[PDB]
Paper text:
We determined the crystal structure of the non-adenylated apo-DrLigAΔBRCT to a resolution of 3.4 Å. MR search with fragments/ensembles from the predicted AlphaFold2 structure gave a clear and single solution. Due to poor electron density at the beginning of the N-terminus and end of C-terminus, the structural model only contains residues 81–593. Non-protein electron density was modeled as two Mn2+ in the catalytic pocket, one Zn2+ in the Zn-finger domain, and three extra Zn2+ cations at the protein surface. Because we purified DrLigA∆BRCT with subdomain 1a, but it was undetected, we infer that subdomain 1a was adopting different conformations in the crystal structure. Neither NAD+ nor AMP groups were found in the catalytic pocket bound to the conserved K128. Interestingly, we identified an unexpected two-metal center that stabilized the empty catalytic site. In our structure, the two putative Mn2+ cations placed in the catalytic site are predicted to interact with residues D293, D295, G391 and also residue D130 from the conserved motif KXDG. Considering different reaction stages and conformations of LigA, we could infer that our structure of DrLigA∆BRCT represents a pre-adenylation stage of the enzyme. Moreover, the ligase activity of DrLigAΔBRCT was preserved, but its affinity to dsDNA decreased in comparison to full-length DrLigA, and reinforce the assumption that the C-terminal BRCT domain 4 is involved in DNA binding.
Bacterial NAD+-dependent DNA ligases (LigAs) are enzymes involved in replication, recombination, and DNA-repair processes by catalyzing the formation of phosphodiester bonds in the backbone of DNA. These multidomain proteins exhibit four modular domains, that are highly conserved across species, with the BRCT (breast cancer type 1 C-terminus) domain on the C-terminus of the enzyme. The 700-residue protein consists of: (i) domain 1 which contains a N-terminal subdomain 1a and NTase subdomain 1b; (ii) domain 2 which is an oligo-binding (OB) fold domain; (iii) domain 3 which includes a zinc finger motif 3a and helix–hairpin–helix (HhH) subdomain 3b; and (iv) C-terminal domain 4 which comprises one breast cancer type 1 C-terminus (BRCT) domain. Regarding their functions, N-terminal subdomain 1a confers the enzyme’s NAD+ specificity, and the NTase subdomain 1b contains the catalytic site.
Residue numbers in the entry: 81 to 593
Write the structure that this text describes.
Amino acid sequence: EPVTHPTQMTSLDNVFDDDELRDWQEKLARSLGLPLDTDDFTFTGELKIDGLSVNLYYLDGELQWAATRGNGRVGEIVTAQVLTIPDIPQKLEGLKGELEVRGEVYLSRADFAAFNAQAEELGTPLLKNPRNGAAGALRQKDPEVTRTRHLKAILYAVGKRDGVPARTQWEVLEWLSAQGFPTSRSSEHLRGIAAAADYHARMIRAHADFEFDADGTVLKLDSLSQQEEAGFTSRAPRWAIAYKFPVEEVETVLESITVNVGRTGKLAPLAHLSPRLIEGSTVSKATLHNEDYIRDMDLRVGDTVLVRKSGGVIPQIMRVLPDKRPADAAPFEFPTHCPVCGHEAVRAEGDANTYCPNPACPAQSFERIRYFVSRGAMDVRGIGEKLVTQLLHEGLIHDAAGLYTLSAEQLAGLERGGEKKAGNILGQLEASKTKPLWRLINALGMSHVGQRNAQALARAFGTLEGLLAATPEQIEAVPGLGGIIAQSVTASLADPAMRDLIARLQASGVAPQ
Ligand SMILES: [Mn+2]
Ligand SMILES: [Mn+2]
Ligand SMILES: [Zn+2]
Ligand SMILES: [Zn+2]
Ligand SMILES: [Zn+2]
Ligand SMILES: [Zn+2]
């Protein structure tokens, strides 16, 4: 829900090298009517954080709402999600008047890379940059989603300051941290344009050694009496500026392209390059995403390419270099079959991921077995992650049907000598055989086929034989599953390992309800 900011959140100008910072001081000293050759200016140096700017509003000391920047005048109320952020106060004593604290909600570099890595082997959408990741965490209807993402935030300015005794920006930061606000660890009280450029350089050589992406520094004029005088240009003020860090893009050569199979089945590619040093670490493997990403980038195997790290962490590629291409470099013939199991590998009409059929693929085996067992499937309490891993280390089960073919002595003759718990585990098996039919298709673990899609698939036919014996046209005509879900369903049943798993399942005695 939109809300109008009390004071408008203006943007900032950008300086990239030293000469542009000198023109910045020249513009500032001129806007105040001072001799151009002056270095008496006291500054304040924060960091430009790769996140989302957020504004707070405290009336009579008590918190009212938390909103995003939006367009600089009207933001979006994220009152509940910002309160999932830890050290966020809601009541300041001895304070009366409109308080407007400004800040920035960022996301940890490790929490950021672990998300895209989760999205890489799964096929679910991926985070572009730390700003979209912070916005993707804030803009969530359920605040528990934001709480489960470790959303961390920093506040580094104040606008409407009714009842704030701070008279300089350095005392603003002191007053913020004194009231219990989460402030920036690195913020220096600078004097002179030379000390500001030195500070910016020291943050450059500390860019990689942070827990959060900082894409530059922020230089503010110390005296508030001078801030409320220099004024604004049009979109940015004349008393504060952002000094961006230099770009970090290293040129290297692409060597080999490999493919890994995700636990779900995502056929995720991977690029291997000549090991080059970026900032500090030596990057040699780059994320390659999906097939259409390669085809759009025209990444013929053997090309020389540019590469960086997304937010300073995730190594993603940039583009190709046609001037340095070999004439014999052929376009990468994308694999049509699974590399680790051999079975066919086909993708849907619109889905960019490629996926893999059923369980013979060792990358899916463990995930398919434990998904077959959970509450969302066949309800087999007793069989846990520590037990399934042993059944694969010893090699007693192949797919989910191998569980029903086990004996009481095979499960009792294991670790800790559990006889009665093997009886409880066995009882859940035959009790699962007479469970409803919709719980079976979901337990197979096909792509896109969730708990809701498996129920609509069950209402489509009703009988198990009607699903195996049904043309692709009559199964694409089901309501709920168009031409992307139903197309992924047909590829599963057309696979022999799925037909073998289902046949062994009915051979053990599965007659759904
Ligand atoms: Mn950076
Ligand atoms: Mn960045
Ligand atoms: Zn320059
Ligand atoms: Zn975390
Ligand atoms: Zn096979
Ligand atoms: Zn496979």
